[PDB]
Amino acid sequence: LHKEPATLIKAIDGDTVKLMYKGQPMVFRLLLVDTPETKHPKKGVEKYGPEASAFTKKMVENAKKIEVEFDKGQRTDKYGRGLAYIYADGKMVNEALVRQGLAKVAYVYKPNNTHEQHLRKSEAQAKKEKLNIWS
Known part of the structure; x- marks a missing residue:
């Protein structure tokens, strides 16, 4: 696995960010994690959803460098979203959410x-x- 540079466009939700990757806007879903969401029917804004979403947003909006790391398998899901580990200045966002009890x-x-x-x-x-989800 290698990291590749990307540029923030917009954070969308706890588990989804829109990036400029190789010159094209693309929606990325964070691999291996489930955050409570703000964007889904039935439920709507689940508990700890705004919190997970604010965590991901601050982390990518305050970064100097964003990097994407694809895994060994498929790199897009059935919705067209990139499947990747996302890094903000060296720190994996997927892991940070999990470590904080936000995913x-x-x-x-x-x-x-x-x-x-x-x-x-x-x-x-x-x-x-x-922490959080686990409290």
Whole structure:
């Protein structure tokens, strides 16, 4: 896995950001994580949804450098969104959300699972500290 540069366009939700990647706007879904959402019917704005969404937004809006890292498997989902690990100045956003109890590790589809154990470890630590989702 290699990182590639990208430029923020807009944060959309806790688990989705719009980036300029190789000169084209593209929606990216963060791999391996489920945040509570602000944008989904039935529910609408779930609990900790605004919080997860504000966390991702600040983190990418205050970064100097954004990098995307695709995994080994498919790089887009059925909605056209890029599937990737997103980094803000060296720090993985997917992991930060998980470590803060603002996301759960999703159901995993091999082979897009390279960072799975690392996230699962952060998730185990956030439950132990009973952070947010886990409180």
